[PDB]
Symmetry: D2
Subunit: 410 residues, 4 copies
């Protein structure tokens, strides 16, 4: 009894000390050290993935200080000569474990070869096979327990970092736009990952990727931060698309025409766009539009009810805006997205993720510049990651992106 | 070229003939035989799970004709003396494959022992280890491709039947009510299961379980058939619960008080309940209430807009009803459920499932009777399954349930 | 009872008919059809691996008739443009299953792409991804039950052929010569493979590789057919090597000297070599040496006792020959091997294997020619396989080897 | 370079210190600390199985000091109330990993339940789910690399101890006696296990079981320590059994008669038995028989050549003894075994195994007493294990066996 309480208090103290090093300088935890200690067992288990995560964190710190890019790629011999880390994506835990075992085997073989040699070692090159591994945690697809168990599996199998997306689970298509989850759902997934890492006692890095730039749908409107980017219909006489297609289910090649007719009938606009295009019809001009834009902007986290209230106070009328009739067949709301939505999502995800990852359909320096500026204006010391969806001036472009703040690209 | 078209046409013809036997007497397929033939490969693969599914279908036909129950349970030696089938639930494909291999091994051993004996076989009892296996397909959790691959895996691993629920994926809790998916989502999952079985050329049975009786939440309001059972707030002055808890995030033990205060402030009622309790205030009585109930009933599949239109035509006023403010933190709409919702869901799932499964929190003969009466009044020859959530008069209760139409219980 | 005996007799009849087609024209079975039928279960299971084995057998028949080589290699897209089969070796069942699934998936995708196109198919090339797979069954390492289960696993996972070696299990080294098993042990393994294939009802091909050419050790002297190739000491005053090294276990670099001294002290010769080098000392010349060589030759299957008896009848003295003192530390007898030992082993393995495989340390046309001549002089219609241990005139060399009788090379 | 040598020397020093604690007080290592350090990688990995092995070693030390038995058995809830350890045998690594995960999960759940309670903990019982696991390493079946990898897998999956047998791999039958390997082969397997544990840096216990008491065959005669127990034929006119059965392969039911006739024709006796029964025919009596028995005894490790030399010096004639004609069909030599052979094998295995395990066909107190006396007379502080092949006075029998020196029974 007394020894049990003594070791529990010692574990709480060591967890609190563990949260004081510069590793967690910008990590936001909603759980107390007592909860993490209670979640742990009576046998303290250490994982080499924690050491790999420490190595990756130190590498990213060095690259951020030096404003240099850490090259990555999706054969272990040449995966350590030219790379600093390996990103694994599609199962995925099996790939991570196999790669970790291969790296350990090659490191063991190299050390056996080198130690048996006593002058000739200087001529023999050294290869650091122990490259930190970034694991894509896209095999959960349900709730929070799945991501907890996935984080446990990744930590046990040597992953130094875990990557998750705000894309809706079970919605990837071979593609008519991506489907997002509310910001709070992705924040909860990140918090679950961090809590699982704390339970396992690992320094595992959390990597969050936002797919809002190319996304066209969102699962729910429950989060106010998304309300700015939700597309609704400004035509009160337009019925629901899903109901219209259900009651008129004609060939799909001809249903594409009914969809086009409905889309033209109801002006699909954002609420701020709707009030802007309505306020141009009737002088009241610059002052009220400017103040509405200042108070209702993509980075304002303003709920749609508050936006309607402000429009009523300014314009003087209740602007019609129904985003339910624009829902897809499965109920996904139409979503605008864009670069500013990506900036908002990255700012929201920064307290819970070590790396903020932005996807791009095409290479555009201006988009990366504005995303980096927004994220580093909200959270200055936030590491950023960049990639392109699947010339010779790519080197200088990568160098410029690294100078922007992107310390992890592939 | 010519041989390729010849074998493709022969495959289409054999698929069309395969869909003519009494096995698919009440199976609704949205795909053509051409699509199923095109989805198949150049190597025709037969699975013993198809024979097991045929055996299970014949057994269920015999039990339905005899109005007898097929006992089941969640050790293969005593799993064939007292049972006709085995239901496997939680991974699950691994359990199904292991059980199938064990059954095959025991059958092989029994036949080896019997064939080596030439009079003494009559004294030796015979055990039919080849019991059809019902597999719980709850490991997908995302989209339609996952359930397709899960059906393929179950067919390859000897499953004679696949069971799915309309409960929301990744929402099971250790429980503040279940979360449902729209009826069309479960119908799509059933159609995907049937299409996968047709692609693999298996007679695999589809078992659909509805959890609407104990459910309290629904993921989306996109399906009109669910609109009757969606709970909304009749108080125009009540704000969103999720927003209120976000802006007031006080201890949870005290947040339980804010939730109670909000719940009391806004009358959480169904729309038909709202118009009933409003129409009692002011005579217009029996005739219009009766006609509204006849036109707006749980088994009417009436959209909420149509219900509001009928109420406006009858009552004369726009009854306030906002189900968005009653959403949970993650965006799940409040759902009523009940036995009539289960009847509606079972009627909708009957064309796509061989077995319709109803869950019960507690054993109630009246609830089972009314569910069976509704389902067999819509679809007469629909097999039913019954189970209780985890005395001596259980035998007569089981016999009565079998006489009702439940041919599969455990 | 009556139906059970009826179906058992029908199964026996269908097995006997199955053994009458030209597939088993040269297959020797020690088990009766009754035993195979009794080993089967009550559920007849068909495997696509049987169809793949039929395809491989037909391909090998065509190549043997045309005296052409079937190219092979140890990426499924280019594994079907340039190859007729794939050999899988190192686990191995997992590789076979993964490759089989990949081939099925690619075939399915190709047929989906082609069937959706109705003229343009002629321009589109056709790729036969369903290449027969040869599986290396080297993961058993113990007894006969292991090879039975391994054959079952390979048949279930799509293997069209199984390859085994006469090398001693658990003796491969990274190499101071290979260790062989007695001929009867490999024959028993081949018989077990054939019996397992008959139990599963598959036309799976058995491939037997002999490693006797480069082998230097043999596990046992129990088989008379090996007695000709066993190395013994002709010096009666030489003690056991293993005992000498046990009682003198000095540094290994110096133990290499004790081994050399012992090897020089005792003349390590074959018994026929010993009697030849002894009969040269003292005239008795051509006639008796010639008759001894005719009666004691590598392809005579003469036991060592019979050889000693013949030498005593001819020479007149008991020639000293002790092969126990030449055993290794673990008890492996010294073995000569050579090409004639390979010919003897291939002749012994021919009744039980569809393909006879000969390994070569270096490419030598004379060695392949003599091996092929011996094997096809014993069993004329025996398919042969050739490979080299791991220029531009390789094409004509392969063509010549194919004309010799080698129908499967890689 | 300099840091590499520095850390290598530090690792060698820490390995040498690790070998100084009372854990390795009686452990014989043939490898140097330099070899173990060179076999390790650049990433030091710690396993909780090492802590479990430490716990098991401390438990066995306490039981040996207290002369008490550690009960074991082949449900984790009741596996910790009544047991101190769990032995896992038949795959087996998968069972060990599953049991280890179950134990960790139950320990985690228990600690979560207890820590959330702050007085009421005293009433709540405590269950130590972390029971050390003994793993049966019988899945290698080939060479030394297999047992090395198996030891690595067991250490990684939470095994606190590894058990191996001297029975021949791939020879277990459902039984006409067990087949043994030479003593040196089992010693090499134990040394490989210890070397693998040292490479992984684990305190894993090695458990060695000898099956010589019930064994009737031995794979090889290469080890002098086995030469005393090898059965040979004393009839010079008897041919080889294997050759006789090969040339007379009549029904097996009638071959059982040929085997009996051959066995009666050739007196199957041990060499000491042969010289004893021959020296009784002709006085020379007590003195020379006594001195031969003293110099040629089961615990003398006398080679057969030395025994023949002593018999020739004493009796005056070369006693005929041929153990090759008594070999089985597969080449296994006839082996006597008995309790004295078990004592010899246990004495030989004691330097390399923490626990010496003796199997018994039937419970006999005298046999266990003599085995314990022999083993503890050679190596005094050697832990012993006892089990019976698969009443109320079993408690006192277990207590007596524990007082003998058996500290681990099940």
């Amino acid at each position: 009894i007394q020894k049990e309480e003594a070791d529990f208090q010692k574990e709480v103290a060591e967890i609190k000390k563990w949260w004081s090093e510069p590793r967690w300088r910008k990590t936001k935890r909603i759980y107390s050290a007592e909860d993490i200690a209670k979640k742990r067992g009576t046998l303290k288990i250490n994982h080499p993935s924690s050491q790999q995560a420490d190595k990756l964190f130190k590498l990213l710190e060095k690259h951020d200080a030096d404003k240099t890019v850490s090259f990555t790629f999706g054969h272990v011999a040449q995966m350590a000569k030219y790379l600093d880390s390996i990103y694994v994506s599609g199962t995925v835990p099996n790939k991570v474990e196999h790669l970790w075992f291969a790296q350990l085997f090659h490191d063991r073989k190299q050390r056996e070869e080198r130690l048996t040699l006593s002058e000739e070692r200087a001529k023999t090159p050294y290869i650091d096979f122990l490259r930190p591994i970034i694991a894509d945690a896209d095999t959960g697809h349900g709730g929070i327990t799945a991501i907890i168990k996935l984080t446990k599996m990744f930590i046990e199998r040597g992953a130094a970092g875990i990557h998750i997306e705000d894309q809706a689970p079970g919605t990837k298509k071979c593609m008519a736009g991506k489907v997002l989850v509310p910001v709070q759902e992705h924040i909860n997934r990140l918090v679950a990952i961090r809590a699982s890492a704390d339970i396992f006692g690992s320094n595992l890095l959390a990597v969050a990727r936002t797919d809002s730039e190319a996304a066209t749908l969102i699962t729910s409107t429950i989060d106010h931060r998304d309300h700015y980017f939700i597309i609704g219909a400004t035509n009160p006489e337009a019925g629901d698309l899903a109901a219209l297609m259900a009651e008129a289910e004609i060939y799909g090649n001809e249903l594409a025409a009914i969809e086009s007719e409905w889309t033209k009938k109801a002006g699909l606009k954002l609420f701020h766009e709707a009030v802007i295009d309505e306020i141009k019809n009737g002088n009241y001009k610059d002052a009220l539009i400017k103040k509405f834009t200042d108070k209702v902007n993509p980075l304002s986290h303003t709920s749609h009810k508050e936006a309607k209230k402000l429009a009523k106070e300014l314009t003087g009328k209740d602007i019609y805006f129904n985003w339910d009739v624009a829902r897809a067949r499965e109920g996904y709301y139409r979503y605008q997205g864009g670069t500013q939505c990506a900036v908002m999502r990255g700012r929201a995800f920064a307290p819970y993720a070590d790396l903020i990852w932005m996807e791009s359909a095409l290479p555009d320096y201006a988009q990366a510049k504005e995303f980096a500026d927004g994220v580093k204006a909200a959270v200055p010391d936030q590491w950023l990651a960049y990639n392109l969806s699947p010339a010779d001036e790519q080197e200088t472009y990568i160098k410029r992106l690294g100078k922007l703040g992107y310390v992890w690209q592939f």
